[model samples]
Target: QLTPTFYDNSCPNVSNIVRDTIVNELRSDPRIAASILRLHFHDCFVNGCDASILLDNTTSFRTEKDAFGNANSARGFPVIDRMKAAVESACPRTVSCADLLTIAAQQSVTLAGGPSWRVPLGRRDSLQAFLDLANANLPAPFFTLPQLKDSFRNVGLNRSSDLVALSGGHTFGKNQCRFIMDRLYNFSNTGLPDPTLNTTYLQTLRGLCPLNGNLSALVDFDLRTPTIFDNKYYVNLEEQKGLIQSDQELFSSPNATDTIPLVRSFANSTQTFFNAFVEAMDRMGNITPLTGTQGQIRLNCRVVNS
Candidate 1:
């Protein structure tokens, strides 16, 4: 069974190993925190928290890493590998990459200046990766509030408060133009930009991601404090400055009332957002986890048993 003490006797130092590796990666590149945290989310949202997202394409199975939502986006694999090597040397076959991912996410958030939570451990790596389900179930960058809400619900996180606070995960991380560029030039078929976007913010985004299609250009999701874990996402949303439609819709949709005041509360105080964010992360992390020998402690994390 998954428990905070799963590794207590099995590998007392497992969390330290993961935390140190995460800290090293964070110092090497701050974005490592975001990549790993997002990796955990991608893992939990699909079928369950089974480390399915880390699997590599094998002769028998195609992995989710190459799925449309992840192709160029999902990153930080070498970092996971580094931590796995350390753990394997200390306690071979004792710790699962799925649990490493869960621990790494907590360290990643604290390293990125976000509230850290104690995630229950003991998730095992899946033998197979669901490529089609990843593309089908992962929320798209352009989804409206309703669609975004439903995507979270599909993963068993149905609360409006969870939806809003979880969307605030953009308090860090960024997105590329290829996925969302159309929101800038042709959001609707009318050949006009999204008018609800703050006029100046629209111009700024256009500058970053040209309509002619610089597909790989990067845009900061949180303009105010791009790399910090704060309430800036909701603060920006209040002005229609959200970089992703899914994010902005948290405060702009017709049923926006469900999350607007919550957004306002979060925006007004960092403590308020952090408390909600902490709970949301814990809730999302608890989604459909694999435990009790259901999966394997992957030797390579990217591949199954021999």
Candidate 2:
């Protein structure tokens, strides 16, 4: 089983090393906080918290980095690399890249003004990246409420509170126009924007994502306080200002009975949201981990041991 003290003896300062590296990187790019957290989510959801998402393409198989959901969005590799390098220098071949990622994610949230939690470690790196699972398993911006629940359930995250709390992570990140063009221009091939969009917000998005504009342009998911990790995402949903269909569906979907109350509760109490988020993240971090000498600890996060 994973434990908070897994690396206490082997790498006593591992979490500090990760935090220091992230703190330094945040000086130049504050957005790296959200980017790193998203990478952790993308990694865990696919093949569990196995660091398979960090693998490079091989002669025989494509890397998970090239998967549909991660191609251009999954970032923060350099940050994780720097963290690994720092830890390796202190305790060579002792810590796993998977554990580094889990710690970095927890540190990222705390650094971004969110709640902090004890991160259970001891995870090992995977020998292979699951490209197919990366594409098929990761939830998307266009997923419906039912689809989102199914995606979470497939990975053993069955609680509706888990869905709402985890989605709250979007409160600090930017949503790319590529994922929202359908909502702004031709939702579900309707040749019109999503009717659920707030009229003012719709105009704003249209301006940010014109028909001929750059598809990669990004807009903040939480307008009230763009960079803060809070419950504003749930608030955005209630106001019809959710930036993505999947997010908006948490409250807008007809079948959101299980999730609507959660959105409301989270919106009303940031503390409640933070608590749920910490627990959900803990549960997510435990998914299908490689333990008991099941996988190798990679020296470099991007490739297997040589």
Candidate 3:
């Protein structure tokens, strides 16, 4: 049973170590929250938040960062590296990189004025990254809300509510146009907006993501407060302004939709959303964690203990 007391009493200064580093780094880069959050998601989905996603890319073997879900996208390893170095210097090998990741992600959310959760510690870093598992596990931006639900379902989460609540994490991140060009143009070769999408919202996105435009150009997910963490993502979905198909689909499917009421409820209730998010996040982070004497404590976060 992992507990909040895992580090504060035994390691004493460990909490300050990672939190201070995260605060300082976040000050220098506000985007660090999104990056770190995504980093946590990738690491988490692959190996139950074992920090395998932080492994370095060398000539030897496959790492999760090189996988399809993360390639040309995943960010925040260098941030984790620097923060882990500080933690190791202060506490030696007492702290596992996996635990640091759980802390950093929660801290990031709180720093951005989002809900805070008590992170259960004692997670260990993976000796190897699950490269093949990445593609199959991480839900893509283009996934339908149902597909997203199935993805979360496969990972042991309560799919009904957690999927929509978790999408609120998009309240801080950016999405690439390539992920939704189809929605803006000819979705499924239909040569028009996805009928589920609001026509006005469709026009706005069509202007943003041109058919021949650069795929690397991006747009914020939450239109109102893109950098802040809140229930605005649900609000955006209610308006058909969700940046990704996966996001809007939660509310867009028009034929007696099952997900819109939760969207409306969250849009009207920040406290409700925050409380649910924290609970869902706890479940997400705790999925099959490596406790006791399972995985090793990664020294550099970039490589396994040698």
Candidate 4:
């Protein structure tokens, strides 16, 4: 079973390495903290947290990096590569890329001002990437409340709280306008903005990306504190300031009856949101991880051991 002390004997310095790397990366890229967190999320959702999302195309396998959810969206693989190289130098073949991702994700949250937790380690890397599963499994930015529920359930995340909590990843990071065009202009093909978007916020977004504007323009998910990890994301949703359709629906959709209360509590209490978020991340990291002798401790996260 995974344990927080899994690296005590062989790779005691691994956690420090991850933290230091992220800290340095943050100096040049303040967004990196959230970007890496998404990388881990994308990795875990697609056939577990095996770093399958990092794999490059092989003769027999396609990488998940090119899948629908990640194609141009997922960032921070070079940051992972930097951490992997440093870890390899310190402990040789002792650590797994999967464990590195789990640790890095936690560290990212903490460095961004969120609560920290003892991340259970000892996960192993997958030998193959699931390109098809990446496309099918990862939730899209436009999903409704029910669709979001099914996507999380299919991956063993059964709690409605988990859905709301993990969605808090939006508390930090930048979202491309490409993902929100439908919500801003042609919501549900109604030829008008999504009625749930705050009218003032809608005007702000429209100015940021008008019709036929730059699709790749970026917007902070939490405009008030773009780089801070806190409950303000839930608070924004409560105020209809959520940046995307999927995010807003957690508090505004008809099906939000089950989620609305949780949103209100989280929006009101940072500690409550922090605790649930840590548990949700832990649950996400445990999704069908390769343990013990099930998989290899990959030396190169981008490829299976040569």
Which candidate wins on lDDT? 4
TM-scores for all predictions: 0.95, 0.98, 0.95, 0.99
RMSD of each: 1.4, 1.0, 1.7, 0.7
The sequence of per-residue lDDT tens digits that candidate 4 reaches over residues 208-293 is 98889999989999987899999999999999999998899999989999999999999999999999999999999999999999
Please report, as a residue range, the 10-residue window in candidate 4 with the lowest summed lDDT.
175-184
Local accuracy of candidate 1 as per-residue lDDT tens digits, 1-306: 567888889899987888889877777687888888889889988888888998988888898988888898899998999999999999999988888998888887787788876777777888799998898889988888888888989989989889888788798887898866767888768688877789898888888888777788877889999888778888898989888888878777887888889989999998899898888887887887777868789989888878
Report the lDDT of model 3 for residue 30.
Answer: 74
**What's the best-to-worst order under lDDT?**
4, 2, 1, 3
Candidate 2: residue 141 lDDT (0-100): 87
Full candidate order by TM-score, most accurate first = 4, 2, 1, 3
- Runs in model 4 lying further than 4 Å from the true structure: none
Question: In model 3, what is the error at residue 92, expressed in angstroms?
Answer: 0.9
- 1 or 2, greater by TM-score: 2
Q: Per-model C-alpha lDDT, please?
A: 0.85, 0.91, 0.82, 0.93
| Residue pair clashes in candidate 2 | none
Best by TM-score: 4
lDDT of 3: 0.82
lDDT of 2 by residue, 1-306 (tens): 999999889889998999999999999987999999999999899889999999999997789999999888788898899999999999999999999999999999999899987799889999999999998999888998999999999998999988999998999878788889999889999999998889899998899889878988888988887888888888889999999999899998988999999999999998999999999999999999999889999999999999
